[PDB]
Amino acid sequence: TIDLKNFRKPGEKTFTQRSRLFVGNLPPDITEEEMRKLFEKYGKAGEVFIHKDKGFGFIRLETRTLAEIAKVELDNMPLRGKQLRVRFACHSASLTVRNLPQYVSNELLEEAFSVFGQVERAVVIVDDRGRPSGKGIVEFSGKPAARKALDRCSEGSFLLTTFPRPVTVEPMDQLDDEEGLPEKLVIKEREQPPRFAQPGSFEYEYAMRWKALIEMEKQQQDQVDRNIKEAREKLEMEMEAARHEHQ
């Protein structure tokens, strides 16, 4: 395909880790200028790391748009007999923020955590109807800024708005639902293909015991939902009572 400009978004920070592309399965006879020439179509390129002996490397494009266009056009593309594996590199300084207050936004989350370092991107997770789920993502420029935010919020209570409930900051558990699990090695489990177990057989009997504890956890996870709910309303009632109290 072909389309031009640098495709910068209004007020977008350029050359972040979001525009960092991992390029795998490279041929062993490739140099730095050759990979820059391969991405010459997608604008200016910043850092370029290469492992010639192993066949992978890194390249950071200007914006997220140019990186998404370079991914869809170069992924699984032949090059000197080998197929290229283009994939967004995992963010090395990403943080998960839970227990967000009711009124939050991406800019509020970015401005708040900017006191620990240079925030590349902050996002408030929203559901299907645009409602926040209470979880957020904060991505910093470097690892020390992310660890600083993690330490300060682990031993101290970091408040985003007026409501006195601190947010919970955890390291980002990067889950991949794009490449997935195409294939693996031999740990026999696939002697029998996928099937519906016949009612009365040993497979059906033993699998119903598995569904029993699955729904047992659902009741226990819902029971702790009620234990926290009643203690939450008790604390919220104690706050509105102290709100009226003023000497």
Partner: protein, 239 residues
């Protein structure tokens, strides 16, 4: 692959009030022949299917946050209406095995096994069908009956996929709709210092969150011990 799938439909929000059916197609003109086109002229949003997922991802990347007669356009992928959550997977289920398994319920648009940062399966997966009744059939039969993927009688738990949005979050422009958002921002972000009126309750909130963590990690630990004993007594497979 297949052309004009549900994974190719794009959501274009914040359209002008006088948007027409044919003018909406002029935007995605250089992305091939437009597929199914629908626009909500009242709210000012619309859907459009492109020929492939690649063309849809390019049009989304180029047209998102772009002006049109004054209003900024919000381009994103439409929420897949025929998506199912697949969990309780053995660590030996691949994307092809998951696709081949759920293919008997209908045409599969995609099927992936969610993995961690290293590449190991998390026991959960996603399956997206071509039609919602096809996903309903897979959801009913797997819940009413027992659907196995490997030799071990480990049933698969199928649920409707709660699709969250971590790409485009909640912008501040959309947060200004509720007046209490500006009321909450009267106090800037801060750390609660001792002696404050809010410090006493901030620690009680953090103590309540620690109590919630200890109880949920105790529940998830008891299930893992129960899930390990099931694979232990399975060695005694003789009736």
């Amino acid at each position: 692959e297949k052309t004009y799938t549900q994974r190719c439909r794009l959501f274009v929000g914040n359209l002008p009030a006088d948007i027409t059916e044919d003018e909406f197609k002029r935007l995605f003109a250089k992305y091939g022949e437009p597929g199914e086109v629908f626009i909500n002229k009242g709210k000012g949003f619309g859907f459009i299917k492109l020929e492939s997922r690649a063309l849809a991802e390019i049009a989304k990347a180029e047209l998102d946050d772009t002006p049109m007669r004054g209003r900024q356009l919000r381009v994103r992928f439409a929420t897949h209406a025929a998506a199912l959550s697949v969990r309780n997977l053995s660590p030996y289920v691949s994307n092809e095995l998951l696709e081949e398994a759920f293919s008997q319920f209908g045409p599969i648009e995609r099927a992936v096994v969610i993995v961690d940062d290293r590449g190991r399966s998390t026991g959960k997966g996603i399956v997206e069908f071509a039609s919602k009744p096809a996903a309903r059939k897979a959801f009913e039969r797997c819940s009413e009956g027992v659907f196995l993927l490997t030799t071990t009688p480990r049933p698969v738990i199928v649920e409707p996929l709660e699709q969250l949005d971590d790409e485009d979050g909640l912008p501040e422009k959309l947060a200004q709709k509720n007046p209490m958002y500006q009321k909450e921002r009267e106090t800037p972000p801060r750390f609660a210092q001792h002696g404050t009126f809010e410090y006493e309750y901030s620690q009680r909130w953090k103590s309540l969150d620690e109590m919630e963590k200890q109880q949920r990690e105790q529940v998830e630990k008891n299930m893992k011990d129960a899930k390990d004993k099931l694979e232990s007594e399975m060695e005694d497979a003789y009736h």
